[PDB]
Amino acid sequence: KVFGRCELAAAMKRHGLDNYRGYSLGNWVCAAKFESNFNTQATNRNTDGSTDYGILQINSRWWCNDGRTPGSRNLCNIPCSALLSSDITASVNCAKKIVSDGNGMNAWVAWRNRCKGTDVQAWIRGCRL
Numbered sequence: 136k137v138f139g140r141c142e143l144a145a146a147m148k149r150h151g152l153d154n155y156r157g158y159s160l161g162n163w164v165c166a167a168k169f170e171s172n173f174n175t176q177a178t179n180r181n182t183d184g185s186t187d188y189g190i191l192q193i194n195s196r197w198w199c200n201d202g203r204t205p206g207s208r209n210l211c212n213i214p215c216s217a218l219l220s221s222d223i224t225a226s227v228n229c230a231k232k233i234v235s236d237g238n239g240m241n242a243w244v245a246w247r248n249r250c251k252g253t254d255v256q257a258w259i260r261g262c263r264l
């Protein structure tokens with residue numbers, strides 16, 4: 136699908152992320168346009184041999200099952216492609232605690248540079264919510 140700016144953010148406030156776990160709902164949406172550029176069909180492999188999945192862009196090495204990653208933990212315990220589909224109602228459940236493991240957004244990398252030290256808060260700006 137192609138989520139336009141105001142149409143790919145309101146879902147967080149539909150999935151339990153608004154002001155969820157010390158991160159304001161606003162502290163998230165910026166990175167989305169720095170992660171897949173509002174798409175769940177943008178995915179890559181990694182130099183590390185790690186593959187990625189979805190707009191979420193998770194790697195199969197540590198988080199989910201694609202099977203080409205042996206010795207991967209898979210604590211999420213669900214098929215990676217379960218995210219890439221246009222529908223995402225369930226897909227947040229893993230991203231939901233990926234921080235809960237205590238490392239924060241530090242698992243995500245772009246958000247420490249493209250949105251961090253900047254005003255992300257100016258990204259969620261203007262959409263009625």
Ligand SMILES: CC(=O)N[C@@H]1[C@@H](O)[C@H](O[C@@H]2O[C@H](CO)[C@@H](O[C@@H]3O[C@H](CO)[C@@H](O[C@@H]4O[C@H](CO)[C@@H](O[C@@H]5O[C@H](CO)[C@@H](O[C@@H]6O[C@H](CO)[C@@H](O)[C@H](O)[C@H]6NC(C)=O)[C@H](O)[C@H]5NC(C)=O)[C@H](O)[C@H]4NC(C)=O)[C@H](O)[C@H]3NC(C)=O)[C@H](O)[C@H]2NC(C)=O)[C@@H](CO)O[C@H]1O
Binds near residue numbers: 170179191193241
């Ligand atoms: C296109 C776009 O927008 N983004 C681009 C992206 O697509 C490109 O590719 C990157 O792909 C990678 C995978 O190939 C994607 O995933 C991220 O990969 C990075 C790699 O650097 C991951 O970083 C490390 O991730 C591991 C796994 O979670 C981290 O380990 C956890 O850390 C916790 C705490 O921090 C640890 O816990 C405990 O620590 C205490 C300390 O006191 C200690 O007592 C314990 O012993 C210790 N636990 C043990 C026993 O280990 C624990 O080690 C572990 N827990 C877990 C596994 O949950 C590791 O710490 C991370 N590095 C640091 C340092 O924090 C990152 O986790 C991973 N994220 C995802 C989504 O899974 C990535 O999406 C993607 N890009 C990124 C990352 O932005 C890149 C090309 O390079 O370009 C992007 O732009």
